[PDB]
């Protein structure tokens, strides 16, 4: 019973991304420590929009695969998922091996599952305060 139309009300003009239930503040202060400022002002907004769009796509794929049913491109919301996947697959080639170097996982499937909160996070990983600062 997640908001579906309310996501498309917040759909951006190009294809980039409460309705997510995630610590926003805490994630921005986490990425502030890792050195996102050194990628340029233009670069950090592109990277944050990339990570937000991957988070929305992982939320969509989690919503779909509970009923069983870059490759993700219902017929009524197929257009937004198609243009979001095309926005993902273009700007991802600018950043090879960016989820290890930003300390989020192996690849984007490992990163978005940990950031969404359905998969465990190890003690050797510093991603323990992204779900627990919202618990405080």
């Amino acid at each position: 019973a997640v908001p579906w139309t309310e996501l498309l009300s917040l759909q951006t003009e190009d294809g980039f991304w409460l309705i997510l239930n995630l610590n926003t503040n805490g994630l921005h202060s986490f990425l502030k420590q890792k050195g996102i400022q050194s990628l340029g002002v233009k670069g950090r907004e592109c990277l944050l929009d990339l990570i937000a769009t991957m988070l929305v796509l992982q939320f969509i794929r989690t919503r779909l695969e509970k009923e069983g049913i870059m490759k993700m491109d219902i017929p009524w919301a197929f257009e937004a998922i198609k243009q979001a996947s095309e926005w993902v697959r273009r700007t991802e080639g600018q950043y090879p091996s960016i989820c290890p170097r930003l300390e989020l996982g192996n690849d984007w499937d490992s990163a978005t599952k940990q950031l969404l909160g359905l998969q465990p996070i190890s003690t050797v990983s510093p991603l323990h305060r992204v779900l627990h600062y919202s618990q405080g």
Partner: protein, 199 residues
């Protein structure tokens, strides 16, 4: 790995940017420094770096944005105002406000310098064997537009409208006439037209 020290403090953990092929990276100085080529840079001075791979910045260099080269087909050229004095990749001296064009015979791809301004992409003007055109303000042998004048271009010919120039009334078509058809036409200025042997 890094072993710490009492009198040395880690400020931040900077991350490289990935320059792919047919791109370049613009990055200014925050302080009077030198770059990786070993050239002096004053504060605020921007420049481009054109090495492909991961590019790690220096401590004073700042990464502003990535720039991608423009691809030049035979039917397009590149209109470029100059921003200040420099010498381009072909090695000719430009001056402030000077405009020119870049074609395929120069390069297949051109990455726009920080000393240049992309004004637009100029599509080619092509004339058939039955077409002509009148160029307003044509460019003379000194490279400067001759204001006020005109120039009539006819034939199977294709060319670029250089900056300053303009077509008068578009691509026009030539008057073919049967022997049952004639034209009445007036002279504006004293002229000489020797189409045949006479004048």
């Amino acid at each position: 790995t890094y072993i710490p020290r009492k009198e040395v403090e880690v400020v931040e953990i900077i991350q490289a940017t990935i320059i792919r092929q047919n791109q370049a990276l613009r990055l200014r100085a925050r302080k009077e420094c030198w770059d990786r080529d070993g050239k002096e840079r004053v504060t605020g001075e921007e420049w481009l770096v054109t090495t492909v791979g991961a590019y790690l910045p220096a401590v004073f260099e700042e990464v502003l944005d990535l720039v991608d080269a423009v691809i030049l087909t035979e039917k397009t050229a590149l209109h470029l105002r100059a921003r200040r004095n420099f010498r381009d990749f072909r090695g000719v001296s430009r001056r402030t406000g000077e405009e020119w064009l870049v074609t395929v015979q120069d390069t297949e791809a051109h990455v726009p310098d920080v000393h240049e301004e992309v004004l637009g992409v100029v599509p080619i003007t092509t004339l058939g064997p039955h077409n002509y055109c009148v160029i307003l303000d044509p460019v003379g042998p000194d490279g400067k537009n001759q204001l006020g004048q005109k120039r009539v271009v006819k034939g199977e010919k294709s060319f670029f409208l250089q900056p300053g120039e303009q077509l008068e009334q578009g691509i026009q078509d030539v008057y073919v006439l049967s022997e049952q058809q004639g034209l009445l036409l007036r002279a504006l200025q004293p002229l000489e037209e020797g189409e045949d042997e006479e004048k």
